[PDB]
Write a protein that binds this ligand. Sequence first.
Ligand SMILES: [Mg+2]
Ligand SMILES: [Mg+2]
Lengths: 254, 255
Amino acid sequence: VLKIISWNVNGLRAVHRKGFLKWFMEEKPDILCLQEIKAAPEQLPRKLRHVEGYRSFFTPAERKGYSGVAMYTKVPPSSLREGFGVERFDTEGRIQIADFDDFLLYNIYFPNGKMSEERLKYKLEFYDAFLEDVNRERDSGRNVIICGDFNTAHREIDLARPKENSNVSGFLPVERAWIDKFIENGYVDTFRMFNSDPGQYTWWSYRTRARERNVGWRLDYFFVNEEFKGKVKRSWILSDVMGSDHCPIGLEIE
Amino acid sequence: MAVLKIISWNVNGLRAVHRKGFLKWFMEEKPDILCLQEIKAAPEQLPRKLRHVEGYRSFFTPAERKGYSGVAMYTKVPPSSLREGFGVERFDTEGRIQIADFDDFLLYNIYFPNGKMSEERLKYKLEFYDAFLEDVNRERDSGRNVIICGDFNTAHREIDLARPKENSNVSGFLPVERAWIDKFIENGYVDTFRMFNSDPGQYTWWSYRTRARERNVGWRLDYFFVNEEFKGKVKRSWILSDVMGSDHCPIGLEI
DNA sequence: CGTATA
DNA sequence: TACTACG
Ligand SMILES: [Mg+2]
Ligand SMILES: [Mg+2]
């Protein structure tokens, strides 16, 4: 009975100032996966660096205050790989692959593609590198859990304004195709196993005050390989917890 | 020799001053050379109206880090060459150094490091200071005359800032920093402004936070220096306090 | 306070 | 509309 939470936290120091630890005390996950920590460990308060009952792993970006992922775990992994083995994709703080034996756990902050053509390219090439990597591991016999911010809504149901954004990165046809392909390689969007409703979102723009209007996108997913699909008992969106432009998502196993 | 006008200005974002009518001011004041620091942009990010100004050749030396540091020079008359570093990698990749050969003189356009945020940055500042001295001395020793302008990030004497006592432990008026200026001057260089003006309350930078500029609670961080052999040629050295757009104001030199 | 990637 | 960096 393992509870895993994924959250693009939009600055760890920022959520801390909004009572992140309190929420983390209340919700007792067995694993906590975070994206966009936007900090080097040394910049973090001591109460955040170490938390009672957990082992903490930080993977910052080389660039200061950019990107970065973190994992808190009640039970240590056998190992923790911080890259795919390709330099350009490995130095932005985007990748945590934690071996818990039963399963590898992928904590990923996938690149946003909105600001440039060259970044959109970076995103898709990251996507590619990711697939090779996760396939290599599942093909070798391992069960995989993949959480994090994918930066893409898959289907029209997955965002409030699908037509206006058909030319916006995050709902480009090229991007949605990749998710299609991803799923075809034997992986399941665990949330879609339990919920087929519309209006289920994980990110809302700050600019519009869109969150109260509920004008969002689903950018955050839990994926498993299908062989492991048996073990997933719950997969939900904690859309009530504030502090970031994303909300956290949840997965329960065994 | 005769009738040459040079302006130095820490512009605090070239795109920023542009939006406040920088070009208009640049039309009005007609300098023969314009030296800028903290452009905070790569040339490609700059409006075409700025990369190409009528009657001037423009040189941009951005930092590797995007939107950080950076210097620029506009000149009516091209230099023979333009060196963009001291030949030491760490000091060369931040956008801090333009050394332009105008034959008569080399012209140093420098954005010296701010030392306030960390011990390690304060250290970077003093080591920059050192590298700079060696460089300017080699050139002066070789016979070359030199004009050095820019944001030194340090007031020299007690008269150089409004509040000297409270800031004696603040980087920008640390004893170690003022000592270096002392040493700098001792190597045969002159603070051209001090040649013509010994009044207090002459400042070039004012903090944004306090709205200090209307209270005139400033520091003098921007200087024109020459080697003493060339001192003969400097006819004027002033502070253009009139000009807004940045937390620094521009300074002027006439030779 | 102010300039500059999600 | 915000978080971050660095001034
Ligand atoms: Mg975000
Ligand atoms: Mg400044």
